[PDB]
Amino acid sequence: RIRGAFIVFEGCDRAGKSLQSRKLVERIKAAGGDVDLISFPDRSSDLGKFIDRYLKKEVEMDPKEAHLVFAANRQALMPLMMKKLLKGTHLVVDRYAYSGIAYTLAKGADNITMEWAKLADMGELRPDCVIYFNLNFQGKVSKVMEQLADEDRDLWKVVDASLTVEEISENVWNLVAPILDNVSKSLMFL
Amino acid sequence: RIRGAFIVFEGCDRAGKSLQSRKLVERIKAAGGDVDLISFPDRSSDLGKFIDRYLKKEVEMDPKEAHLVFAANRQALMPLMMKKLLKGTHLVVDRYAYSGIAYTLAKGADNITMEWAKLADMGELRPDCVIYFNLNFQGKVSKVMEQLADEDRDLWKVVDASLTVEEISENVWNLVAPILDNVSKSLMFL
Ligand SMILES: Cc1cn([C@H]2C[C@H](O)[C@@H](COP(=O)(O)O)O2)c(=O)[nH]c1=O
Ligand SMILES: Cc1cn([C@H]2C[C@H](O)[C@@H](COP(=O)(O)O)O2)c(=O)[nH]c1=O
């Protein structure tokens, strides 16, 4: 067993996650490393195109409905992701189950709790590290992201997404690099 | 609290569930009762039309993906269903979470268990009675339906779907009628 690391980037919209994920992937390749970039929702599947329609406000879904649909989109990619990590390929993943929970809880729907919202993604891979880009609807998403982060300060590392692009990139590298060495370990699951 | 009963019909395809559900609804109305008929998957929503495309083999979904999507389609209707029962309206429901489990387990996918498959539908209403129409892919769906039925012989009543239409209708009435009187009770959940 020689496995890659599983790195998740989380945060509110506009936090520069998309760019910082491409940069981390570039640093890992500059270290001769094998790495793939995954982004959720995965819009390339049939369900992902439905989700894209949802995000464009062309189709509607209730809170619990939408929660399970975004989770199904993640569950769909677990065989591919497990194969890649086991081959030794690192995964950098932009948004994951935590976005799923935070965006679902921020809707304030009746009869949803955090305990309920954790059921949908059970069995999915657990990341070796979650990088949270810390920078209204987005305001309550951040509140949930803070509660998740403080629930598990082992997994969650918080970067200052207000600093410069190159500066954030540097701080992310400094957190992630020790993990790349240390994991080559059993897979962890939610 | 004066609530209606929640009756689920389950079984393999071709078991006459669709007709027997319309007949039960007719008997309840003939008893002056308020009743609505619900069928899953609910093809009238945006997600339900996606599911219809799935069943027509026009879109694809992996086992775990499909499981959560069919479950989201059920979760979507829970506010409506709870409102109806609380108003005293009986619900006769053709297919439910149990079909969801059975059809999902019959695919024989890797890394699915019955324990996993029960997570998606948690929080949904639990029926007061499940009528199982007892009459290859459909062969393993029946095997799962038998295991579910024998797990909980309080809830599950098994009818002989080989007898005549009018005869099955009679046997279903004889099981359901005592429940209609007795529930008018707290709601039960999965
Ligand atoms: C992964 C995920 C994303 N989202 C949202 C966050 C974004 O507003 C949107 C698309 O994200 P994106 O901009 O990163 O593509 O989908 C959810 O609502 N639930 C989820 O589970
Ligand atoms: C409710 C439900 C139905 N199904 C299947 C059973 C049928 O083959 C099909 C449509 O059922 P229908 O003929 O009762 O409309 O969908 C699932 O695969 N999963 C589910 O959760």
TrEMBL record, chains A, B:
<dbReference type="GO" id="GO:0006227">
    <property type="term" value="P:dUDP biosynthetic process"/>
</dbReference>
<dbReference type="GO" id="GO:0005739">
    <property type="term" value="C:mitochondrion"/>
</dbReference>
<dbReference type="GO" id="GO:0004798">
    <property type="term" value="F:dTMP kinase activity"/>
</dbReference>
<feature type="binding site">
    <location>
        <position position="43"/>
    </location>
    <ligand>
        <name>dTMP</name>
    </ligand>
</feature>
<keyword id="KW-0545">Nucleotide biosynthesis</keyword>
<dbReference type="GO" id="GO:0006233">
    <property type="term" value="P:dTDP biosynthetic process"/>
</dbReference>
<feature type="binding site">
    <location>
        <position position="103"/>
    </location>
    <ligand>
        <name>dTMP</name>
    </ligand>
</feature>
<feature type="binding site">
    <location>
        <position position="95"/>
    </location>
    <ligand>
        <name>dTMP</name>
    </ligand>
</feature>
<comment type="similarity">
    <text>Belongs to the thymidylate kinase family.</text>
</comment>
<dbReference type="GO" id="GO:0005524">
    <property type="term" value="F:ATP binding"/>
</dbReference>
<feature type="binding site">
    <location>
        <position position="70"/>
    </location>
    <ligand>
        <name>dTMP</name>
    </ligand>
</feature>
<keyword id="KW-0067">ATP-binding</keyword>
<feature type="binding site">
    <location>
        <position position="13"/>
    </location>
    <ligand>
        <name>dTMP</name>
    </ligand>
</feature>
<keyword id="KW-0547">Nucleotide-binding</keyword>
<dbReference type="InterPro" id="IPR018094">
    <property type="entry name" value="Thymidylate_kinase"/>
</dbReference>
<dbReference type="GO" id="GO:0005829">
    <property type="term" value="C:cytosol"/>
</dbReference>
<protein>
    <recommendedName>
        <fullName>Thymidylate kinase</fullName>
        <ecNumber>2.7.4.9</ecNumber>
    </recommendedName>
</protein>
<comment type="pathway">
    <text>Pyrimidine metabolism; dTTP biosynthesis.</text>
</comment>
<keyword id="KW-0808">Transferase</keyword>
<feature type="domain" description="Thymidylate kinase-like">
    <location>
        <begin position="9"/>
        <end position="171"/>
    </location>
</feature>
<dbReference type="InterPro" id="IPR039430">
    <property type="entry name" value="Thymidylate_kin-like_dom"/>
</dbReference>
<dbReference type="Pfam" id="PF02223">
    <property type="entry name" value="Thymidylate_kin"/>
</dbReference>
<dbReference type="GO" id="GO:0004550">
    <property type="term" value="F:nucleoside diphosphate kinase activity"/>
</dbReference>
<keyword id="KW-0418">Kinase</keyword>
<feature type="binding site">
    <location>
        <position position="74"/>
    </location>
    <ligand>
        <name>dTMP</name>
    </ligand>
</feature>
<dbReference type="GO" id="GO:0005634">
    <property type="term" value="C:nucleus"/>
</dbReference>
<dbReference type="GO" id="GO:0006235">
    <property type="term" value="P:dTTP biosynthetic process"/>
</dbReference>
<dbReference type="InterPro" id="IPR027417">
    <property type="entry name" value="P-loop_NTPase"/>
</dbReference>
